Design a protein around this ligand. Sequence first.
Ligand SMILES: [Zn+2]
Ligand SMILES: [Zn+2]
Ligand SMILES: [Zn+2]
Ligand SMILES: [Zn+2]
Lengths: 191, 191, 11, 11
Amino acid sequence: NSVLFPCKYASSGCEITLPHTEKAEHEELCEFRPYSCPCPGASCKWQGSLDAVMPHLMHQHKSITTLQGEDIVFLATDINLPGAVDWVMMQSCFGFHFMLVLEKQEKYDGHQQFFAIVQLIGTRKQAENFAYRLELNGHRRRLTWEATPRSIHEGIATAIMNSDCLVFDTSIAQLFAENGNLGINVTISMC
Amino acid sequence: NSVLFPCKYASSGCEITLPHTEKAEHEELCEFRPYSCPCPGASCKWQGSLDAVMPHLMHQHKSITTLQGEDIVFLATDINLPGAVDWVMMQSCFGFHFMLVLEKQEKYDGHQQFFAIVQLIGTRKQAENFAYRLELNGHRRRLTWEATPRSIHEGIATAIMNSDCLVFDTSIAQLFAENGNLGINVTISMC
Amino acid sequence: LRPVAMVRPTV
Amino acid sequence: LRPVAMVRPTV
Ligand SMILES: [Zn+2]
Ligand SMILES: [Zn+2]
Ligand SMILES: [Zn+2]
Ligand SMILES: [Zn+2]
């Protein structure tokens, strides 16, 4: 069985070479796979080296906020808007840029829910060195979600599919929002 | 020169008459206020004075496990049973008894949620001197909920309806689960 | 490390 | 005291 196929992406680096039923089990976990625009829109169909990503969003989507500091407040404006809404924002700290996204959608026909999560614009070895915390205050009530951030490689679609991130429903975002506005404190930290 | 009005419960032999500005304040602590049975499920139909509530529980309901402690683990066992389920146990401390309820509820076909919450065998003035914190742990992720203990009067079906509790889908559960067991940390503290 | 209460499901 | 980003939505 020593039939050792090259990786597809070795045409742009990769030097690994592996048995047939391990290929697509590596070719999505490569460090040499090209990137897709990590903006949570379905629309943008960009691709390129990790290093041309931050340049991508800065030119193509100038529409998108940025802030520095390992401890900011992402303030999602006007939460009650009816329909699939979404907020995106960026948080530079630690030599790195992090993408903070909050995605309202109707997950099961008849129950609309929020879905806030963070990703590091970096390689997954790279994400594994951080941890993030989102947290939502309201009158003597508080709900916190913490975990390490995704690589924008992996993308987040899967996580929100399985629910690995912070997930609450409009009902409650009510005692958290102030005047139609949800504040989510994000602290990113290291380990 | 005020007008005063008889306590609500006076039809249970309360003999107090108070200006409306003040009739709540006392109507709450009025020792004539009769309580239902805190135990989740319309099973029991007992009714008695606050003070008769804790004996009632430790008389007709001995299924209910108890614990002395200010920090415990409420370990909701065999999480995956299909359908509606309910764990319930009790936590004594600070001279009070608090009642913890995990509750699975399939209220919107196909979307099965867990809903966990705490409640004090006491009054609403009483609850306010306290905060609970439930917390789930998994591999490099944690999700924590704080609130002040609900009140045996107020009950908890509305809390549960509003999602004014901690709440998390099963997919989530799995990432926090242990051989089919869900360990909830719980700490009650004073204020 | 805290005490553990192994609770059973009801209906 | 934390910085604040007022982020605008997008349908
Ligand atoms: Zn490769
Ligand atoms: Zn793009
Ligand atoms: Zn009275
Ligand atoms: Zn009873």
